[PDB]
Amino acid sequence: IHKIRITLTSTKVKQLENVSANIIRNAAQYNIVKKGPVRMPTKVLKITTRKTPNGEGSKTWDAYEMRIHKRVIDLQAPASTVKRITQITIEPGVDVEVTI
Amino acid sequence: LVVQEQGSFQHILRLLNTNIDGRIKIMYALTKIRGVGRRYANLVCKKADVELTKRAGELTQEELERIVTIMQNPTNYKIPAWFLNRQKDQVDGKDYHVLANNLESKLRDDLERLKKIRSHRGIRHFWGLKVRGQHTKTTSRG
Amino acid sequence: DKAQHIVILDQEKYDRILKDVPTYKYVSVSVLVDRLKIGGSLARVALRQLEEDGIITPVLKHSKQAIYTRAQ
Amino acid sequence: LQVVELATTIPLDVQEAQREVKLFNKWSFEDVEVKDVSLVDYIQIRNPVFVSHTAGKYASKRFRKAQCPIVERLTNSLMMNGRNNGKKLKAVRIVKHALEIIHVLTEQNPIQVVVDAIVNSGAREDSTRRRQAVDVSPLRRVNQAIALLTIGAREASFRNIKTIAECLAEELINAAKGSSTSYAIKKKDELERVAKSNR
Amino acid sequence: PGVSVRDVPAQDFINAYAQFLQRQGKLEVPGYVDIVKTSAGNDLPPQEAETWFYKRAASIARHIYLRKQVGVGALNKLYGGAKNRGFRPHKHVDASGSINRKCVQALQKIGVLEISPKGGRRISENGQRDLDRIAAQTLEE
Amino acid sequence: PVTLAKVIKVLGRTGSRGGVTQVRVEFLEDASRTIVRNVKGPVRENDILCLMESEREARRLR
Amino acid sequence: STQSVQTFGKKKTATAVAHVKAGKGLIKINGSPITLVQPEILRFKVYEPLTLVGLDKFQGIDIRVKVTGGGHVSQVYAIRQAIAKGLVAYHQKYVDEASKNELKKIFASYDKTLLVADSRRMEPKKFGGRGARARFQKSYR
Amino acid sequence: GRVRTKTVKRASKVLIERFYPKLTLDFETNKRLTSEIAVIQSKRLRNKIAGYTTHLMKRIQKGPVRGI
Amino acid sequence: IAIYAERVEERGLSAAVQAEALKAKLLSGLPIRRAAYGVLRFAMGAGAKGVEVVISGKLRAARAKSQKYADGFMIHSGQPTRDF
RNA sequence: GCGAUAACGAACGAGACCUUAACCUACUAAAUAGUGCUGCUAGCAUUUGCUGGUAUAGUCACUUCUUAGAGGGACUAUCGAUUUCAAGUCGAUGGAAGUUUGAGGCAAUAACAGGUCUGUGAUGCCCUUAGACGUUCUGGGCCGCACGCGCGCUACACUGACGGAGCCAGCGAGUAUAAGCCUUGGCCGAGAGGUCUGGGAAAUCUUGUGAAACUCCGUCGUGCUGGGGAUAGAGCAUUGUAAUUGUUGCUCUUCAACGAGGAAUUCCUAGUAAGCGCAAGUCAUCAGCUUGCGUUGAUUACGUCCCUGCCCUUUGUACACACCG
């Protein structure tokens, strides 16, 4: 019984939602009381740069973007069982941090 | 409160050292003196116990002379060393709030100091060009 | 510099101000300035005075517009 | 009559406002009517408003602007020459003080004076590019009238000790009586005289 | 009716509390109030020479009352304004730190403000009473 | 004297820049007369229009 | 808890959250009464939803609207919309439907933005000029 | 303008040829019917096709229609 | 870290592989048209919906030209370009 | 698109699409959002009321407002009209929304001797390669001023300037044994700034970014005036190894031209234009610049082919380097 906090953040929403659903399921069936998920406001990383590699022509601009999403869930259970739940439920697109 | 009053109304266009018009409020009439600004005149008129709602004509000789003394002896009336002019005088190191004819005397002195030593700023004053590093390619036509 | 206004309240002028202002349906800073050749800093205080010792009554009060009508 | 009590004290002059709607809680609309049959539909005074500021959407369609309250149109046209673009609180205050000053000078409903200045000020024939005499539509008549009145007042107040509200009141009353002292009648007279020669 | 500051218009409340604070007398008005500007972005000193400090302190006390834990930098931000920068465009500048700090220190020694936990200054029990009573008198008339 | 007339049909836009509109005005009191006239502003049907002198007919302009 | 509804009102970024509960006719703005709401030229905007329907509808209810965001004019419009919608919502949840329809009808017949929010929002600014539509000044030779 | 392109019009014609009996003169019923029958990649296109199908069914009842 | 290798599922549906192969045959002195049509045939065999090969530079002459070699179906605008 | 049809079936572009804005008391939730209550408590009147602080252990509840997945919604829906009665179009009604609902990203074929070899360890050929055209250090220059021009910022004032008071956004960014980030609060200093703490790798702290225009109350009073603040003298600070050719900031003093701008000429159709600031980029220092963002918020069209051009058809041509022929 620890107040474990998991924080999920990734640039691609499908996999992040899959990870949040997986932890919700593996904290449900393994009967643990859970307090989420909670969605932080999305972060839009904007780089606006000139299209031309020289300085000629009409002044036209590109607006590139990298979105970031962040979800948090709080778990109330022993440390090792939540650790194993986190360890099985990974994905290349979505990085994790378990903290107390 | 409006007051009916006469006699003391001298519209005399002659005031201290220069022809300061009497129709203008005292805070700003002193700004005619070269060396005195709105804020310096405002602070002097405060230190001389002159209600600023009184016009330059409405004043009398006691206020005039107190203003002269407070303007020419700023320290003696608690004017801070940062509020006056020509701080740390180049000649003697004192704080001198320089006024009308001394103002031109000291400007001539500073400029001639710069020219005699052959400083770049003095040489540019000599040519009539801007000294503070501004561009003159396009905007010094006048 | 023109328009040669009046810079102080004066006895003859004060007789003028007392005599003429009850014949005005509308008085304000501008009305006094252009029917008295006084300045504005005098017109404002004349309106205030005549407000205390009643000679002019107000319709509206504002910093930028003073509206004043006949006392009667 | 309608007095009724609340935990927070409500001003009494506000309680007087349940019976009718009045401009600045001082001027009534229902006693104002338009003398010109042609201009009745393009001067909207039928729907009372408390203040000449409604944030309406009047640029959407073509004639939707004719349904704006006329005092609001005058207020908007006070908002000009760059420095005064956007400052509509100042404009509505100008209009309110002008209505007061009009009532003081002229023992009439100031809305009526505004309507009369607007109906007198608009040229009925004009010229279009050699130029040819043409007639003027009612809506053009109305908004040419408003533009003329506001431009005349704004010209008068510039570099003059007289306030903008007083210049506005002066222009409106001079137009409302149809005298050549106003800026709007003078310009209307010019426009119709020129349209005369072009027939 | 239980009167508070929120029930009275601001302008006349700051006026009344400043007249009270100057009538009362004990407030520690500093000696440089005849020489200084309120803001570096300002150009001229306050016109009301003999009262501006009292009206500043009254508005400051009302500001503290209406809130929780507001310090001297936030008052510096509050009382600042646009600066005339000549040919450059206008820009916000903060107000004078010494003035606002001396005002809050005078209000604190008269027992109106008090150092709060979490930092800053918050209104006092007697400060709340004084502000509330000076609000009650204003709305009585 | 000025007469009054009501637009009963909008024929079309005219002028080189299109700033004038052809309308068929119709007298209020003397309902048996219809005159074609040019108008500078925007006009709908039923727009009552004031004519300085009604004894003139217009066809086109550029 | 006896009777309470919650509504909202918007003008472009400003949002006014109103709580309408049973009470002795109290109307409040961020803890201060409506009678001293700023710009006073626009005060009759926040008096309209009161006069147009009669104050008696506000005898039984006690309304505290919290307004945040936007600007002064936008907040005035958001407050008026919140108050009107809140009265209608209370007559929906407790009082009969005929009265609620009558109030909705009168509100709509006077002004549409008492019940329905103005959907206008600021158009995004595009490169090549200082505004949504305005373009940089173009030169030749 | 609101001219409906070839994609919606052809899809509507195919729908009416195939599934005329189970298709009505109401936009909501036809919307659900198109959703179950057609694999439309966007809801906007789905609504446009359903509405044009409703228009054609509403025209047919008064008399036959070319192409269909 | 741990680096592994896996072969490509369709050599002809990979544009990178085809571009590298076209580089190789072009470096090998093989004619430009033959190499481009080799790319096109190979990709169409792998089942692609369409394929385009564009070769630019100075071809046998001082002036630089651009030769295009299309086959099949190709879209240009909208979101589906990023997908397919 | 309807359709006409010596074609018939197709492919690209358009449209679909994607991102974003507007609606949802309809799902899922929230101790990094907010709230109703409840403890403990303030002042003010005692009706059990009005405004607050506090408690991220109160072993409470919730989701209107905030956040964001998962959906719903608009399709011209209804009604009048008109038109091959086909495609459409115009008015109303309802609706959050009825211009393709608003804004963008994406974007065919053919081309230009358009720009870029000074973004590239992208490059052929030429040149140079030890007194170098490589590289590095010191100092200067890129700012140099009779003059012409382009993008702009301040203004010429009273719809204002100054002084007090009121007091409201939105998009964003942020570090550690530094070469050093965002900085609250406390203290000193007129200021600019200095100092000591503490929070924040961030829906948690800066930050409600208490922004500016604006609103109120006074002072000024039609004049180059308290409009304007260039140029200049003196002094104080900060960044930097280094401020002279003022880096920048602050204080006093100096107080120009300009009184609305000739011929010409730019941009713009609604939350738009104009006004007003703010953040990010550049960045040790410096923003009168760009890119976005909100605040206040209009006048006038909703039309035409006159001017400047664009598209399609017919037609003439001695043009094809294509009428700048």
Extract the tokens encoding A36: 């989420």
Q: How far is the CA of G72 from the C1' of J167 (A)?
A: 9
H helices of chain E, in order, are 10-24, 52-66, 72-79, 97-109, 125-140
CA distance B75 to B84: 9
- Can you give the resolution of this entry in Å? 2.2
Chain J nucleotides reached by a protein CB under 7 Å: 1-3, 11-18, 20-23, 25, 29-32, 35-37, 42-45, 47, 49-54, 64-70, 72-78, 86-89, 92, 96-97, 100, 102-110, 113-116, 119-120, 143-155, 157-173, 183-193, 203, 207-208, 210-226, 228-236, 244-247, 250-255, 257, 260, 266-278, 287-306
Look at chain C and count its residues: 72
Give buried/exposed letters for G94-106 (b at 16+ CB in 10 A, else e).
bbeeeebeebbee
Method: cryo-EM
Chain D residue with CA closest to C70: the answer is: D104
A74: amino acid identity, one letter: D
Residue D98's closest CA among D25, D9, D167? D167
What span, in angstroms and rounded, lies between the C-alpha atoms of G72 and A32?
49
| DSSP assigned state of D170 | H
- D81 token code pair: 């020459």
State yes or no: cis peptide before A37, omega within 30 of 0: yes
Q: How far apart are CA G76 and CA G37, in angstroms?
A: 8
Query: Strand order of the sheet with strand D132-135?
Result: D125-128, D132-135, F34-39, F20-27, F3-14, F48-51
Q: Decide: E57 and E33 in contact? Cβ < 8 Å.
A: no
CA D62, D68, D73, D75: dihedral to nearest 10 degrees?
-140
DSSP D137-165: -HHHHHHHHHHHHHHHHHHHHTT-SS-HH
The DSSP 8-state label assigned to residue D47 in this structure reads S
Structure tokens that stand for F22 in this block: 């052809």
Q: What ranges in D63-182 are assigned the alpha helix state H?
A: 70-77, 88-105, 110-121, 138-157, 164-176
CA atoms within 13 A on the CB side of C55: 15
Tokens of D163: 């306030």
G12: left (phi over 0), alpha (psi -120 to 50) or beta: left
- Cα D14 to Cα D11, D69, D140, G104, distances in angstroms: 5, 22, 37, 22
CB D39 within 8 A of CB D119: yes
E9 contacts chain G (CB < 8 A): yes
- CA E118/CA B83 separation, integer angstroms: 39
> Whole-angstrom Cα distance, residue B20 to residue B12?
8
Any bridge partners for residue F12, and if so which?
F22
Token digits of residue C30 = 């501008």
The amino acid present at B3, given as its one-letter code, is V
Q: What does the block give as tokens for G87?
A: 């009265």
Among residues G76, G57, G54, which one has the least CA distance to residue G65?
G76
Contact D8 G44 (CB under 8 A): no
Q: Compute φ and ψ for D22, nearest 5 degrees.
A: -130, 150
CA distance F24 to chain D (A): 13
Query: Considering only CA atoms, which of D89, D109, I32 is closest in space to residue G72?
Result: D89
CB D171 within 8 A of CB D117: yes
* Closest to D89 measured CA to CA, from C62, A58, B4: C62
Q: Which two tokens stand for residue H39?
A: 């694999």
For residues D174 and D192, give the distance between their C-alpha atoms in angstroms, rounded to a whole number: 19
Report the distance separating Cα E43 and Cα I15, nearest Å.
Answer: 69
Closest CA to A41 of A69, A16, A11: A69
| Cβ atoms of D37 and F3 closer than 8 Å | no
Last residue before each break in chain D (C–N > 2.5 Å) = 129
Q: For residue B28, count CB atoms less than 10 angstroms from its CB and return exposed for 0-12, middle for 13-18, buried for 19 or more.
A: middle
Q: Are D127 and D199 in contact (CB under 8 A)?
A: no
Which residues 60-79 on B are within 7 A of strand J at the CB atom?
A: none
Tell me the C-alpha distance between B69 and B50, whole Å: 14
Q: How far apart are CA I50 and CA I73, in angstroms?
A: 4
The 3 state secondary structure assigned to chain B is CCCCCCCCCCCCCCCCCCCCCCCCEHHHHHHHCCCCCHHHHHHHHHHCCCCCCCECCCCCHHHHHHHHHHHHCCHHHCCCCCCCCCCCCCCCCCCCCCCHHHHHHHHHHHHHHHHHCCCHHHHHHHHCCCCCCCCCCCCCCC
Residues of chain A in contact with residue G127, where contact means CB-CB under 8 angstroms, are: 59-61
Kind of pairing between the strands at G61-68 and G27-29: parallel
Q: CA-CA distances (angstroms) from residue F13 to D127, D195, F19, F52?
A: 16, 20, 7, 22
Phi-psi label, residue A73: left if phi above 0, alpha if psi -120 to 50, beta otherwise: beta
| Interface contact C59, partner B, CB < 8 A | no
Angle between helices D110-121 and D183-197 (to 10 degrees): 20
Q: Look up residue E116 and give its DSSP letter.
A: P
CB atoms within 10 A of CB B53: 10
How many distinct helices (H) and strands (E) make up chain C?
3, 3
Question: Residues near A13 by Cβ (< 8 Å), separated by ≥ 6?
Answer: A69
Please enumerate in sequence order all residues whose Cβ is within 8 A of that of B6, keeping only pairs 6 or more positions apart, or say none.
Answer: C10, C11
